[PDB]
Amino acid sequence: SLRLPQNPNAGLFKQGYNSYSNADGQIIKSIAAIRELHQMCLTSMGPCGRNKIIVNHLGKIIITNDAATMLRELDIVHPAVKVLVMATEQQKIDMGDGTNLVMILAGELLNVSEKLISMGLSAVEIIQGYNMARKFTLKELDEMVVGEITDKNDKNELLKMIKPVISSKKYGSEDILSELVSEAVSHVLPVAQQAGEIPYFNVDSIRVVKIMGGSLSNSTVIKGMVFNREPEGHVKSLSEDKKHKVAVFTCPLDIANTETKGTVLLHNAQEMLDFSKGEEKQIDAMMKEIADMGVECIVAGAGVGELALHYLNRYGILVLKVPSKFELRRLCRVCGATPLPRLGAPTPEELGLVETVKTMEIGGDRVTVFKQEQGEISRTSTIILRGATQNNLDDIERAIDDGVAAVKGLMKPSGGKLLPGAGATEIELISRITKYGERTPGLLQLAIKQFAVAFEVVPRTLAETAGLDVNEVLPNLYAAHNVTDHLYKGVDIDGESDEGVKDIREENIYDMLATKKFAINVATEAATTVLSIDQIIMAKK
Amino acid sequence: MNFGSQTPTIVVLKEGTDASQGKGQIISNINACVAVQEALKPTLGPLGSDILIVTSNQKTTISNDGATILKLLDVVHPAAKTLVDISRAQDAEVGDGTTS
Amino acid sequence: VFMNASQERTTGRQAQISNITAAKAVADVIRTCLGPKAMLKMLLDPMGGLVLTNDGHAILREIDVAHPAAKSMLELSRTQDEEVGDGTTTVIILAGEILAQCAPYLIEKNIHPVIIIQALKKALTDALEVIKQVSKPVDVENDAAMKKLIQASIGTKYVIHWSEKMCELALDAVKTVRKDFEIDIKRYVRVEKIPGGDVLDSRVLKGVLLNKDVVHPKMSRHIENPRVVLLDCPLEYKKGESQTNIEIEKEEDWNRILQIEEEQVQLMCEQILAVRPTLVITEKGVSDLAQHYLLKGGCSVLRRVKKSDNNRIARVTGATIVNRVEDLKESDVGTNCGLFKVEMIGDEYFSFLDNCKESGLQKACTIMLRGGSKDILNEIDRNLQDAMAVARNVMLSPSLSPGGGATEMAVSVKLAEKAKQLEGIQQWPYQAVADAMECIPRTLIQNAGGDPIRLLSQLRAKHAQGNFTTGIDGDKGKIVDMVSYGIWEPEVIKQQSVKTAIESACLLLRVDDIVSGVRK
Amino acid sequence: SLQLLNPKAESLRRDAALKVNVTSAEGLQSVLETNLGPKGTLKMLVDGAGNIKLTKDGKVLLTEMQIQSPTAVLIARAAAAQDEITGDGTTTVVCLVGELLRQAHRFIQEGVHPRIITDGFEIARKESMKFLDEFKISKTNLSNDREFLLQVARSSLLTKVDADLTEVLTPIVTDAVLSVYDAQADNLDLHMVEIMQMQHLSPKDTTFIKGLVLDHGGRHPDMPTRVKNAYVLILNVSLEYEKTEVNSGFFYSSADQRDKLAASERKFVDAKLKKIIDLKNEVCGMDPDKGFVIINQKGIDPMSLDVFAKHNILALRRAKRRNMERLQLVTGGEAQNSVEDLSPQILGFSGLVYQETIGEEKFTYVTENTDPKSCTILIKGSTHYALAQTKDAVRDGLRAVANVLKDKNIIPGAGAFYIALSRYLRSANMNKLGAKGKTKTGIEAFAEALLVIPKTLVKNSGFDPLDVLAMVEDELDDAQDSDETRYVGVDLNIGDSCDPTIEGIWDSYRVLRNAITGATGIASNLLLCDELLRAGRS
Amino acid sequence: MGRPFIIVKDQGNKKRQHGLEAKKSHILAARSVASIIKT
Amino acid sequence: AKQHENRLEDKDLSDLEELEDDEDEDFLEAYKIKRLNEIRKLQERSKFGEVFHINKPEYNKEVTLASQGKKDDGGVYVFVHLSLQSKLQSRILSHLFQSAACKFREIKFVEIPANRAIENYPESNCPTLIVYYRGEVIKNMITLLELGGNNSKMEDFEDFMVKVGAVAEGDNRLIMNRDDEESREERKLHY
Numbered sequence A: 001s002l003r004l005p006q007n008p009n010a011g012l013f014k015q016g017y018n019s020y021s022n023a024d025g026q027i028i029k030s031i032a033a034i035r036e037l038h039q040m041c042l043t044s045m046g047p048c049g050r051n052k053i054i055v056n057h058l059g060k061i062i063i064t065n066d067a068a069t070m071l072r073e074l075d076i077v078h079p080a081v082k083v084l085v086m087a088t089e090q091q092k093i094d095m096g097d098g099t100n101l102v103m104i105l106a107g108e109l110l111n112v113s114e115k116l117i118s119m120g121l122s123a124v125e126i127i128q129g130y131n132m133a134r135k136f137t138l139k140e141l142d143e144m145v146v147g148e149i150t151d152k153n154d155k156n157e158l159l160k161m162i163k164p165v166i167s168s169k170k171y172g173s174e175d176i177l178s179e180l181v182s183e184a185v186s187h188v189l190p191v192a193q194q195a196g197e198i199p200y201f202n203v204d205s206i207r208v209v210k211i212m213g214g215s216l217s218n219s220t221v222i223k224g225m226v227f228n229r230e231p232e233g234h235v236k237s238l239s240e241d242k243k244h245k246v247a248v249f250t251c252p253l254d255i256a257n258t259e260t261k262g263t264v265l266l267h268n269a270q271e272m273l274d275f276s277k278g279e280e281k282q283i284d285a286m287m288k289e290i291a292d293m294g295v296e297c298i299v300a301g302a303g304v305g306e307l308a309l310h311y312l313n314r315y316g317i318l319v320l321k322v323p324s325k326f327e328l329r330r331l332c333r334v335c336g337a338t339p340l341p342r343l344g345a346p347t348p349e350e351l352g353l354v355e356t357v358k359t360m361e362i363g364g365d366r367v368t369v370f371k372q373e374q375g376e377i378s379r380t381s382t383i384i385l386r387g388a389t390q391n392n393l394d395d396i397e398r399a400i401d402d403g404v405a406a407v408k409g410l411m412k413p414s415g416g417k418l419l420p421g422a423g424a425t426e427i428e429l430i431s432r433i434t435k436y437g438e439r440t441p442g443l444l445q446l447a448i449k450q451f452a453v454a455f456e457v458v459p460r461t462l463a464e465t466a467g468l469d470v471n472e473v474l475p476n477l478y479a480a481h482n483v484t485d486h487l488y489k490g491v492d493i494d495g496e497s498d499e500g501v502k503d504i505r506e507e508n509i510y511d512m513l514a515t516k517k518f519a520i521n522v523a524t525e526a527a528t529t530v531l532s533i534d535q536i537i538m539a540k541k
Numbered sequence B: 001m002n003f004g005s006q007t008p009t010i011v012v013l014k015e016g017t018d019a020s021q022g023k024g025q026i027i028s029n030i031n032a033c034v035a036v037q038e039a040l041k042p043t044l045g046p047l048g049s050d051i052l053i054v055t056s057n058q059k060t061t062i063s064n065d066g067a068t069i070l071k072l073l074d075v076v077h078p079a080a081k082t083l084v085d086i087s088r089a090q091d092a093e094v095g096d097g098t099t100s
Numbered sequence C: 001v002f003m004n005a006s007q008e009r010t011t012g013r014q015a016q017i018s019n020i021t022a023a024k025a026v027a028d029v030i031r032t033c034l035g036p037k038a039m040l041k042m043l044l045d046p047m048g049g050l051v052l053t054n055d056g057h058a059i060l061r062e063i064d065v066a067h068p069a070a071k072s073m074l075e076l077s078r079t080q081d082e083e084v085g086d087g088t089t090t091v092i093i094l095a096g097e098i099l100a101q102c103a104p105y106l107i108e109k110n111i112h113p114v115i116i117i118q119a120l121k122k123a124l125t126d127a128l129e130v131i132k133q134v135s136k137p138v139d140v141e142n143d144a145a146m147k148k149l150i151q152a153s154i155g156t157k158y159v160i161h162w163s164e165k166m167c168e169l170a171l172d173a174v175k176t177v178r179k180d181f182e183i184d185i186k187r188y189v190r191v192e193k194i195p196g197g198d199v200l201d202s203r204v205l206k207g208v209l210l211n212k213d214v215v216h217p218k219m220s221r222h223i224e225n226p227r228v229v230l231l232d233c234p235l236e237y238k239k240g241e242s243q244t245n246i247e248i249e250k251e252e253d254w255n256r257i258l259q260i261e262e263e264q265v266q267l268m269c270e271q272i273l274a275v276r277p278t279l280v281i282t283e284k285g286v287s288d289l290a291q292h293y294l295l296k297g298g299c300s301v302l303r304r305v306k307k308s309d310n311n312r313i314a315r316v317t318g319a320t321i322v323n324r325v326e327d328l329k330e331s332d333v334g335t336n337c338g339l340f341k342v343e344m345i346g347d348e349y350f351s352f353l354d355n356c357k358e359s360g361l362q363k364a365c366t367i368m369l370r371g372g373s374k375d376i377l378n379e380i381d382r383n384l385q386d387a388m389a390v391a392r393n394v395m396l397s398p399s400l401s402p403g404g405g406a407t408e409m410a411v412s413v414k415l416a417e418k419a420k421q422l423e424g425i426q427q428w429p430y431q432a433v434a435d436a437m438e439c440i441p442r443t444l445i446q447n448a449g450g451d452p453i454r455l456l457s458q459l460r461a462k463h464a465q466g467n468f469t470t471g472i473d474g475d476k477g478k479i480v481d482m483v484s485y486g487i488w489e490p491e492v493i494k495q496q497s498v499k500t501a502i503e504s505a506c507l508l509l510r511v512d513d514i515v516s517g518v519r520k
Numbered sequence D: 001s002l003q004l005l006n007p008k009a010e011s012l013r014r015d016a017a018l019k020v021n022v023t024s025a026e027g028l029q030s031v032l033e034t035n036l037g038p039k040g041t042l043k044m045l046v047d048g049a050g051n052i053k054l055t056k057d058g059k060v061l062l063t064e065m066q067i068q069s070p071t072a073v074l075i076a077r078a079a080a081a082q083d084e085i086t087g088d089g090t091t092t093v094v095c096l097v098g099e100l101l102r103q104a105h106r107f108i109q110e111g112v113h114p115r116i117i118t119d120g121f122e123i124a125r126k127e128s129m130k131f132l133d134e135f136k137i138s139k140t141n142l143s144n145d146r147e148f149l150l151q152v153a154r155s156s157l158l159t160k161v162d163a164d165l166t167e168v169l170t171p172i173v174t175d176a177v178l179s180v181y182d183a184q185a186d187n188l189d190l191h192m193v194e195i196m197q198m199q200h201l202s203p204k205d206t207t208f209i210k211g212l213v214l215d216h217g218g219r220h221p222d223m224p225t226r227v228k229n230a231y232v233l234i235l236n237v238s239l240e241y242e243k244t245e246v247n248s249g250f251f252y253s254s255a256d257q258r259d260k261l262a263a264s265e266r267k268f269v270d271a272k273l274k275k276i277i278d279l280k281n282e283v284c285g286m287d288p289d290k291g292f293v294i295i296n297q298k299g300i301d302p303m304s305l306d307v308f309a310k311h312n313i314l315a316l317r318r319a320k321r322r323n324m325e326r327l328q329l330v331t332g333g334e335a336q337n338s339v340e341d342l343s344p345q346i347l348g349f350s351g352l353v354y355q356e357t358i359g360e361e362k363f364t365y366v367t368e369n370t371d372p373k374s375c376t377i378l379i380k381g382s383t384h385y386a387l388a389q390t391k392d393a394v395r396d397g398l399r400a401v402a403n404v405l406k407d408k409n410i411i412p413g414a415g416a417f418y419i420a421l422s423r424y425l426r427s428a429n430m431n432k433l434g435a436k437g438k439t440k441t442g443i444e445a446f447a448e449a450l451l452v453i454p455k456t457l458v459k460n461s462g463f464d465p466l467d468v469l470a471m472v473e474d475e476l477d478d479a480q481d482s483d484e485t486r487y488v489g490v491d492l493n494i495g496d497s498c499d500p501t502i503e504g505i506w507d508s509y510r511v512l513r514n515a516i517t518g519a520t521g522i523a524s525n526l527l528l529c530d531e532l533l534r535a536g537r538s
Numbered sequence E: 001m002g003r004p005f006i007i008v009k010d011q012g013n014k015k016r017q018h019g020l021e022a023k024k025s026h027i028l029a030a031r032s033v034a035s036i037i038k039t
Numbered sequence F: 001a002k003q004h005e006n007r008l009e010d011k012d013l014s015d016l017e018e019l020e021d022d023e024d025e026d027f028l029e030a031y032k033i034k035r036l037n038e039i040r041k042l043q044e045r046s047k048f049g050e051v052f053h054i055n056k057p058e059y060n061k062e063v064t065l066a067s068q069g070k071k072d073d074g075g076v077y078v079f080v081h082l083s084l085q086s087k088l089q090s091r092i093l094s095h096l097f098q099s100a101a102c103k104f105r106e107i108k109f110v111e112i113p114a115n116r117a118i119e120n121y122p123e124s125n126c127p128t129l130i131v132y133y134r135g136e137v138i139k140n141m142i143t144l145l146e147l148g149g150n151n152s153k154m155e156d157f158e159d160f161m162v163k164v165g166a167v168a169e170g171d172n173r174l175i176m177n178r179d180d181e182e183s184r185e186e187r188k189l190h191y
């Protein structure tokens, strides 16, 4: 009675495999273990949320209070957590908004369902309960809409759109960053009396150029872009020509050499004497044609030779490398020209227009600025960020990426209508689902009630970060909905929040309809998978 | 039904990943910045003193301003790197007051 | 560095989360060890033995957990065993739930761990009130109801099939130890074991049972009326408390020194024969020279008897503990001894002492166990301690509470109804007390294989309308009232379960941090 | 639940705890399956010391080979505890628990609860106790049938040893047991019957001695070897020196006083020897024809041995506690401790006392008693394992035959008890029983498990076990209608049925009763256990 | 706060000096270099 | 493994009689004869028992030569004491010799003045304890600061005798092993 018989199925699967089935207690092991990371996204929620510093294995430090950026770097051994990880990444790549609700609503459905499993309700019935509750949630959100927008062009109308998104990440900066993003969208959208038929928009239109140093208030908007690059050859005129035609060549400016390797063959010395002048006259025949039409700027992606640069210096033509291929096409969108791997000659139809190009230092480093006034632009803009630390500017970039991603979420579908925010529609869904559970008798009614209780974390998480008592403002808020005016009740965050009532229209806090629908679906599908599994099979390392 | 004798529980974070809750970490981060602050405390002013740093490669580098002192000392802590980033940003933008 | 601490300080909310998860883990080990269809548990101790049982106390004795919060839960079984002797698994399984239900609030609604304590004392005060009202008295002299009361705990054990004999075995033993208030103690209850035999022929016999035989062969193996006399000193020649150190000079001294060794043992034996006893039980050893002349008078000599058994012989035979032999009289001699007989068993010899049966000192007895093996004896012996523990509470307290979870469910209903009228900040922990009290019937339904969703829903619908004695039949898994079911338990076990479970939560809830590895 | 509590532990639950108890049961069953029956295989046990000990008893196999499994140690205590008091039925308990677990485990896989299954074993066990009353047969001991005791002795001895050892050792047991029965009818096995080791010519030369044999003899050469009429004397007094409780120096002053005080050492011894000489003066008549012998429980001084040698008194020292409790039964005398009060009545009687020696050791033989109330069984053997094999055979044979005289009943064996319970449990009306629900298979599981024992006897002979029960089943189908009460058997010589009543195969009563009771308790407790774990401080 | 307290890499090999006594070793270290070449 | 050895090893001849009823006679009586023979050897070796106050000439006569004993290497330990009436530790060590002599009768206890011990011995180094065995000096001990000094007790002296190999560790006469009867009485009750 000292050594056990060692589980005589040990002839089966190797020691590295670990089984954690149910009955043994898998659900109890999982729902709990994940409460640690549930508090991470809960503390980082709201305008007063705390950012989290994540140092990866390489050492690149990041500080972001989202959920998709954090969990991407966290090497998590627990498999049940990873269902929540890439489910949040789906929200990042598709909509770019709601990572946090997903990590929070998906985890709370597992936390609140502790009562159902512990009481002894069937796991199969719980999946059917949340699925039917999911369908009722999607149908009911359409009726609580009061922000039906149809203009979606002017800048003041975006104050109900961008400023709630920017107010979440770093609440202290609202008017400054909203002016940068809203002015960027106005430059992106074309000037027209009526632009319809689903005009195209992409996240790559608005780029972010991070410059070290300078206060956030000193930032400005640039219609072109700004590269950390050294110009060569001459100083610009900056007002003399009034406009500049810019040719963008994929291939470098050099004598056309083949892909297969060759060399110089000379049978006699007569060709040796003319070979020194032949290379000069060869490029001169191709370079003189470019200068006739007045191309005052050339952009060659590959390395430019010194012989080609020498002929361009005397005529005063600007040169630029732009080695990366992705950022090469964005410059073409500004001027409105096409790429040309052939040398050929410049044509008027394929060549664009650029007002001026000027060179200075913004944060000590010399950069090239492609700002133009009175010119025609189409889907291009940049926001020059000035900040004290690179760690803080990284969060401003992702905040802007989430802001412009919401613009993609609006203009791509037919309607991206608003909803009441600040803990207004979430408590309404608790009343709707509470009334829905009594309409259908059956054993699944317990699942319908507990699905509503999971939505409680949204108001109190704003109160917990605000340093307020949850047991005072949360039940007091229910008395305000008794009865339009009752729909616009929300959670106040201020020193005068003892009353617990603040009107939404005074500050215009709103949320998107499509963002919450996609978040509720991915959250329910995430909880559906974790509650459906019973056995989890590991492996060695 | 089970594969073997026992089944040890999974740690949620990776083995060796440091993490902490409560007000102790933010006080440690503030004390880390104050520890870096005390090195540059007597340097401030006309009658201040220079700082002698010698890195692992055994190359002497004397300085008075806090821009290159913090560049030599490779900082591991993220909270202490905040003082290093603003010092290089102040050195890059203006070029004065990196210690203040 | 600094003092021997700060390895990894678990502080804040995560420290209490580990304690609720650790306290819940203790109850999950013995979740299946409750109800009539409870499963057994074989634990392997590192010395080499084995403990086969289903009692939560005996299970948690052998287990060892390297965690300080779970060890406080481990000690609650010693509170229940050394207070009544029944319901130890009920104590461990209820507390787990109380700590667990209070957790939601601690983790999320941020109620501080002191406001929960104030809510629980008012729930504790109301729990004793409804448990006092739901319990009905019962007559103590009714042997027909006493047999059904004793076998309530036996029904959750292996010997329910022999319940007709165990209730008669336990009832006769309790009345023997019972003193004519009505205080009894199990230290005289002899737990002597006999491996092998059938349970049917096993019976209690009034008196003691020794493991030894007589020394000399000529001793009478069958005496009609034994007269027992207890001795504490040995019959050997006492060397004395100080060295003798006799300076011998003449040749006639050494034979005199060896002759007085024979005469001193004659002097102590001859004065024992003034009363002429039949059986002389000595505590310490006996000499070879003294046994013959005690046989000349007609006594019977035994080997060294440990005084734990001699104190039982003193109450059976009515004799007194005697060490000085010169002060031996006729009044302190044991009498009214029934019969003397020695049976042959291959393990060891066994001397039987029967009583005449016909206030005074309380009488002792020895209960014969004839099991199948060694583990069956230890299994059945703990059942007698659990069965005889029930018989003490009805004598100390004539109240009788309903069983089958009806008592704890009655606490759940009244606390749930009164929670609405208790409007304030104490309402959320006060309402969470009913959520755990309805789990001890939920565990019975899970072990029975039924669905606890509709049964508990049917239970609460009939509990308010039907009666206060409604409960779940553990065998069939249907709602059957305890009046017709005919199984009842004492109310004292319900008090210790509610008191020990709530008082354990008040201690563990105040834990803030855990720091391990300070010093010895 | 156990891993976060204990940093190191092992836990099996709800499928492995059931597989462990069945797999360990089938494993331990396969060890003792081949040993069961008369044609079973022998089994030696050699440890690291190199000694050899040979026997077929399951208790010796279990209580000598260390075992790590938690199930088998309970089978070891169950097989040992049943044999320690009864002396027979060791492997039968292992086969029942070895078979009843696997026979119930198939229905646990079907989904039947363990509680209601074990409820069927208990109510089925009560039916077997009621069946023992009708199945047994009454036998009157007043007839004193020696042939009936010979057949009972050959039942156990044929199982352990071959026919050559059984025929010569059977009447050794019968002559010892024939003296057990008396008017008081009080059975006494441990004090009366004994075993003693002696390396001699062969195992076949075992003989019966009616008196008590002793493993010592006369130390001095001049002391008599053979004595015709020796009257024994029991004295538990120690006749060597005694150190005297703190007594110290014989402070001697002059040299003559030194030896004068040294002579007092003899005075205490001579004071006790004179009482023996005074006793010899009363029985001095016919001194050359008669004799006298003294047996002491403690040592005798060598100075005093010359006193007995001069008077031709045989001296024997350092006897056992058990031999002093047996001289009164053999010689008929009475015991004495002190030398003060003597009489001729306490002296015993012996018709022949002689000594025989081999090598360095010497044995004293006593026999030819007038009315001996006890005797001995001096077993001869070649090797140490030969004595150990005869130890277990005589130990199990005496206990089996002794239990027949305790009660007035005897159970016939050879599968008659198991085959009879099979038809009884499979044909009895269930409405008479109180069990209902899913107790249908519990009756069939325990009833079918009993069939595996009598075919295990066939598995050692090599015949087909299922085919030799065909005519057995056909015999009982016609025996009930033929109006003839007969009990069938299993003869392994020809592979056909037989009658144990005429063949002499029998079994004791309490063996099969305690076996099923101990086996049903152990097998039921192992089924209800659904979790195994190890935890503790070390 | 935990037992590890790290701000820069390789704190064991890096050791600071401060106060009047730290400057005292510098001038006295120059005396050893000066005293060698003083003769 | 140790559970079988504790039956015989951890019981003297007086304690071995307790197992007469439980254990086998041949198993118990075989070891009792062994332990009885060991007791007889100690009685024959008990040639001492009081302090041997010697003169300087006898110093060889009784110390070195005696330590040879039978010279069967029957060695004998001889504890010498260089006494000095003026010092405090000397009279303390003299009392320990008288107490230890009554218990350990096989070990010879010797005492002599320090002035008569060594030619012009330093008085500050007194008291001095020497331990001879087979003519060789096993331990040349210095003043009793190692053994507590002025607060020296009988328990500390008996522990020193075990270190030099004069008395076995598990000896029943040592106060460390000689538990009181009240101690064993409480253990049996709480068992």
Ligand SMILES: Nc1ncnc2c1ncn2[C@@H]1O[C@H](COP(=O)(O)OP(=O)(O)O)[C@@H](O)[C@H]1O
Binding pocket: A045, A046, A047, A097, A098, A099, A100, A101, A102, A164, A167, A168, A169, A421, A422, A423, A490, A491, A492, A493, A507, A509, A510, A511, A515
């Ligand atoms: N000034 C304010 N007053 C009230 N509520 C606010 C204020 N600023 C932000 N909020 C609320 O904080 C919440 C933060 O939500 P967030 O998690 O950023 O949205 P998403 O999950 O879609 O990214 C918003 O729902 C918003 O209603």
Ligand SMILES: Nc1ncnc2c1ncn2[C@@H]1O[C@H](COP(=O)(O)OP(=O)(O)O)[C@@H](O)[C@H]1O
Binding pocket: B043, B044, B045, B046, B064, B065, B095, B096, B097, B098, B099, B100
């Ligand atoms: N002539 C002066 N009179 C008074 N204060 C001065 C003078 N020169 C410098 N200071 C003060 O000394 C402080 C530190 O300057 P310093 O350390 O030399 O520049 P930095 O910190 O940019 O290297 C400044 O805050 C400044 O106010």
Ligand SMILES: Nc1ncnc2c1ncn2[C@@H]1O[C@H](COP(=O)(O)OP(=O)(O)O)[C@@H](O)[C@H]1O
Binding pocket: C034, C035, C036, C055, C056, C086, C087, C088, C089, C090, C152, C153, C154, C155, C156, C403, C404, C405, C406, C444, C472, C473, C474, C475, C487
């Ligand atoms: N036959 C039964 N049917 C339903 N419930 C029972 C039955 N027997 C006992 N119980 C319940 O099991 C609980 C514990 O009883 P018991 O098993 O005797 O104590 P322990 O838990 O100490 O083993 C009691 O509170 C009682 O409600």
Ligand SMILES: Nc1ncnc2c1ncn2[C@@H]1O[C@H](COP(=O)(O)OP(=O)(O)O)[C@@H](O)[C@H]1O
Binding pocket: D036, D037, D038, D088, D089, D090, D091, D092, D093, D155, D156, D158, D159, D413, D414, D415, D490, D491, D492, D505, D506, D507
């Ligand atoms: N010669 C034989 N013929 C038929 N059956 C026998 C014979 N010898 C033994 N048996 C049977 O073998 C079984 C086991 O016998 P035994 O060895 O005494 O018990 P165990 O095997 O349990 O030690 C008995 O039930 C008996 O009927």
Ligand SMILES: [Mg+2]
Binding pocket: A097, A098, A165, A168, A402
């Ligand atoms: Mg957002």
Ligand SMILES: [Mg+2]
Binding pocket: B096, B097
């Ligand atoms: Mg400066």
Ligand SMILES: [Mg+2]
Binding pocket: C086, C087, C153, C156, C386
């Ligand atoms: Mg109980």
Ligand SMILES: [Mg+2]
Binding pocket: D088, D089, D156, D159, D396
């Ligand atoms: Mg047998």
